[PDB]
Amino acid sequence: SLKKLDYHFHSHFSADSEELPRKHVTEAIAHGLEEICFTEHRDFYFPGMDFSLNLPEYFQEINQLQAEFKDKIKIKIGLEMGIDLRFKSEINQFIDSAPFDFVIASVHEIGDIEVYDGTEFYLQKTKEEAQREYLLACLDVVQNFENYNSFGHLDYVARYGPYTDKSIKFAENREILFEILRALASKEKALEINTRLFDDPKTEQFYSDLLINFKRLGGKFITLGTDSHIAKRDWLSIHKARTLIKKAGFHELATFSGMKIDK
């Protein structure tokens, strides 16, 4: 059975969350989670909004919670790092500046245009065009950046936009997704199963396809996260994800300490 965990969530330390870290912990304990990893935002020179992170304060707060809740739950201190290859050396300096336990690499903007509701990213672009541009940027990151553990939300582009049906289909992006999955596998990176959109059967179908093909292409490591910016979680969505992961033939989730896989 898979370790009960959440490896992607945000508290007031992130620019777009105002949640109490203690509340994530008490919610996690009430559900019976064995391990959690805070993954606060850092994105360099982000368009329209600063995603900065106060490392002294962040580490101090979580370090206190680790001590207080030591006997009840395992707590890790991680990072969701927005990647843009233009800032690779600055990004690497930041990641190397503190002893993060776990790092997610995510694409949140492309060419200083944010991928989000109401931005220029989706303007006069078909959903297929938007999906292709987003996945090409992800592939670029996987090919040229190595300082992370797991690749965040491949379906991110399907959260937003003006389309009636925002879903992403594996079949319509098969070649690029194969390239991404194989590159992750060969570099021994984890694939993140992100439960944000799991209320939608089409999201389940997409991740099921991701999982089965990752396995086919040599994938070993899977991380699981809610992406919750508040403490209240959608546990049904998490349970649905856990079922897919097991069904696809993964018998363990990957956990990390100081960015090294736990044995």
Ligand X SMILES: N[C@H](CO[AsH](O)(O)O)Cc1cnc[nH]1
Contacts with 176 (C-beta within 8 Å, 6 or more apart), sequence order: 132, 135, 136, 139
Q: Taking the alpha carbons of 249, 148, 68, 224 in that order, is the dihedral positive or negative?
A: negative
CB of 14 to ligand X, least distance (A): 7
Give the residue with the Cβ less far from ligand X, 49 or 123.
49
24, 108, 127, 240: residue in contact with ligand X (rule CB under 6 A): 108
State which of positions 97-116 bind Zn ion (CB under 5 A). 106
Question: Is 10 an interacting residue with respect to ligand X (CB under 6 A)?
Answer: yes
Contacts with 103 (C-beta within 8 Å, 6 or more apart), sequence order: 78, 79, 80, 81, 95, 147, 148, 149, 150, 259
Question: Is 121 an interacting residue with respect to Cl ion (CB under 5 A)?
Answer: no
Residue nearest to Cl ion (CB): 146
Residue span 220-239 as binding mask against Zn ion, x where in contact by CB under 5 A, dash where not? -------x------------
Secondary structure (DSSP) of 82-144? E--GGGHHHHHHHHHTS--SEEEEE--EETTEE-STTSGGGTT--HHHHHHHHHHHHHHHHHH
Question: Is 61 an interacting residue with respect to ligand X (CB under 6 A)?
Answer: no
Question: Is 227 an interacting residue with respect to ligand X (CB under 6 A)?
Answer: yes
Contacts with 33 (C-beta within 8 Å, 6 or more apart), sequence order: 4, 5, 6, 73
Question: Is 80 an interacting residue with respect to Zn ion (CB under 5 A)?
Answer: yes
CA distance 149 to 152: 10
CB of 158 to ligand X, least distance (A): 12
Give the residue with the Cβ less far from Cl ion, 113 or 163.
113
Q: Report strand pairing: 150-151 vs 190-194.
A: parallel
CB of 143 to ligand X, least distance (A): 21
CB of 253 to ligand X, least distance (A): 19
At what angle are helices 235-247 and 201-216 packed, to 10 degrees?
Answer: 30
Distances in whole angstroms, Cα of residue 72 to Cα of each of 1, 31, 63: 20, 12, 15
- Letter for the amino acid at 150? S
CB of 43 to Zn ion, least distance (A): 9
Residue span 14-33 as binding mask against Zn ion, x where in contact by CB under 5 A, dash where not? --x-----------------
State which of positions 30-89 bind Cl ion (CB under 5 A). 44
Question: Is 17 an interacting residue with respect to Cl ion (CB under 5 A)?
Answer: no
1, 16, 32, 164: residue in contact with ligand X (rule CB under 6 A): 16
Question: Is 116 an interacting residue with respect to ligand X (CB under 6 A)?
Answer: yes
Q: Where does this chain bind Zn ion (CB under 5 A)?
A: 16, 80, 106, 227
